[PDB]
C-alpha cells in the first residue's frame, strides 16, 4: 500500500492463510509461506509488482512453514515447517530449485521454534528458537550435512530466573548469538569451532556456550 | 631536535599536530600539503611513546600492531611520494619521501634494503630539482646496500638499475642510459615477465633515448612494444569486465565493478608514458597513424576504467574518426562499443 | 604405566590451571576497562549534574471540542 | 607411595577445578554489575540538557467531518 498515492498493490493468494514472510534486505525480493496442507513457498519482486516465483510441493504432510528467513546475501532461503516434529531445510532460490538442498528434523522437546534469522556476517549460519529452546545451525555444503545444537539452559548457570525467551539474532561484530527474554534480560552465546586435533575425527560441529546473562529492564 | 622534514631548525610548531616540526612557513606549508592532506593525524598515533605494556603478550601485541601500522603508513607515504614524482609535484614528494625514509630507518634501520626504494625516490625528487649530485648521494648508499645485499630481488635490482639510468640520463652519456635501462628491462622481464607495464616503462625510457638519438625506427619499435603492453593489460581488464557482465544471469542478476585494477600512481605513470609515446610516435613518423589510433584506444580504455569519462569519450571519438579512414571495421566497431559503454555507464 | 599416569596428570593439570588463570586475566582486562569508563562517567556526569543544579537555581531566581460537540 | 600420591594429587586437582569455576562465575557476576551501572550512568546524563532553554525564554477533525 502506498500512503501518498493512496493505492494498494497485491500479491495473489495462497492455498492457505499466509503463515510467514521475509523481505530481502534490498527490498527487491519478498518471500512468503502459508499454513495448512498443500503449502507453497512463494517469492516475489517488489518492483515488477506482478512478479512470480514458487517452490511447489515443498512438504507433503508439513502444515506450512511456521518461520522462514531469507539471506541478506540473497543466495539462500531457509524455512521451518509446522509439523509434530519440525523440519529445517535450505533452498538455493536463485536457482529454479524445487526440492530441499539439505534437511534435518528435530526432537519435539525444543518446541515450536517460531523465530528464525539469517546471519549478515555469514552464508552458512542460522539461529532459531522456540519459547523454550534456542538452536544454532551451520550447513556444511561440501559435506552435504546440516548440523544443529540445542543445549538446555537452567537456573544453575546464574542461580537466577531466566524463564521464557522470544527472539534470537546474530551479533554485530563478534562470534556471538543474542537471545531476548520476556524476563527483561538478554542472553548471549558464543560459538566454538572444531579444534585442530578434532579435525582428524568427527570434528564435532560448532558448539554454542551460554557465556553471559544480564538484566536490562 | 630539528625540522625533521629538512633538518633545519624547529622554527615553528605544527599547529595541526604538535608532533611535526617545520623550518617556518615554506616547509610548514609544503609538508602540510604533502603528508597532512594525505593522512595528517595518523602520524600522531605513531609518534606517541607507549605506556607500559605490562606482560609479554601485551608487549608483543602492542609492538606487532604498532609496527604493522607503521609499515602500512610507510608504504602509503611511499605510494604518495611516487605519485607526487609522477605528477611532477616534486616539492610535495620531498616531504613524503623523507618521512617514508625516516620511518624505514626507525622500523628497519638505515642498513635495510627497504630504504632503497625511498632512497631512489629521493634521487628522483633531487633530479626533479636538478640536484644531480644529491641524487648521486642516495644512489651511492643504495648501490653499496644492494651490492652487499644478500637477497636483492629481480624487481628490487630493476629499480636500482632504472634509477641509475635516470641519473645518468640527467648526466651526459646516452650509452650509459641505454646500458642501465637495459639492465632494468632485463631484471623487470625476469621478475614480472616480458609484458608487464613496468618493463614497458623501461622500454619507454629506452625509446625516449632512441628518439633523442633520432634513431626513429628503433624508437618507434620500443614505443610499439610499450603501447602493445598497455593495450594488452587494459584489454585484459576491459574484456574480462564485459565478458563477466555478459556471461550469465540468474534472476538475482548482478552488476560488476568497473575498475582499473591499477595503482593511481601507476595510472598517472600510464598517462605520462602513453601521452609522451603518442606525441613522439607522431613526430617521429606520422606515416603510421594507426599506431596513434592504438594509443587512443589504449587511453580511452584506461579512462573508462577510471571513469575519466571526458577523456574516455574524447579519445574514443578521435580513435573512431581516425579508424574510419585508416582502419578496418573491427577497429571502428570496437571504438563504437567502447563509446556506447562509456555513455551508458 | 604409573609414571605415565603421573606425567599425564601433572602436565594436563598444569596447562589447565595456566589456561584458567590466563582466562581470568582476559576477563579482568574487560573488568578494568569498564571500571575505568564507569568512573570517568560517574565523575564527569556528577560534575555536570551539580553545575546544572546551580544554573537552574540561578535561572529560577533571574526569571523572577465541547461546544462543537454540542 | 606412588599410587597414594597419584590418587591424592588427582583429588587436589579436582578441587582446583572447583575453585576455578567458582572464581570464574564470581567475575561474571562482577561483569553483570558493571553493565548495569554503565546503563544507569548513561541514562542519568539524559535530563541535564533540558532546562537551560527556560532562562532564554524568560529573557477532532473526525467530528469536523
Ligand atoms: Zn603535523
Ligand atoms: Zn628547511
Curated annotation (Swiss-Prot), chain A:
Subcellular location: Cytoplasm, Cytoskeleton, Cilium axoneme; Cell projection, Cilium, Flagellum
Residue ranges of WD repeats: 51-93, 101-141, 152-191
Signal peptide: none
Function as written in the Swiss-Prot or TrEMBL entry: Involved in spermatozoa motility. May also regulate cilium motility through its role in the assembly of the axonemal radial spokes.
UniProt-recorded name of the protein: Cilia- and flagella-associated protein 251
Originating organism: Mus musculus
Lineage, top ranks: Eukaryota, Metazoa, Chordata, Craniata, Vertebrata
Residues of the full protein shown: 434 to 650 of 1299
UniProtKB/Swiss-Prot annotation, chain C:
Disulfide bonds: none
Lineage: superkingdom: Eukaryota
Subcellular location: Cytoplasm, Cytoskeleton, Cilium axoneme
Transmembrane segments: none
Chain segments annotated as coiled-coil in the UniProt record: 1-60
Tissue expression per record: Predominanly expressed in testis, lung and skin. Weak expression in brain and kidney.
Family: Belongs to the CFAP57 family.
Subunit structure comment from the entry: May form homodimers. Associates with components of the nexin-dynein regulatory complex (N-DRC) and the CFAP184:CFAP263 complex.
Function: Associates with components of the nexin-dynein regulatory complex (N-DRC), a key regulator of ciliary/flagellar motility, and might act as an inner dynein arm (IDA) hub or linkage.
Name of the protein this chain belongs to: Cilia- and flagella-associated protein 57
UniProt lineage: Eukaryota, Metazoa, Chordata, Craniata, Vertebrata
Boundaries of the shown chain within the full protein: 1106 to 1201 of 1249
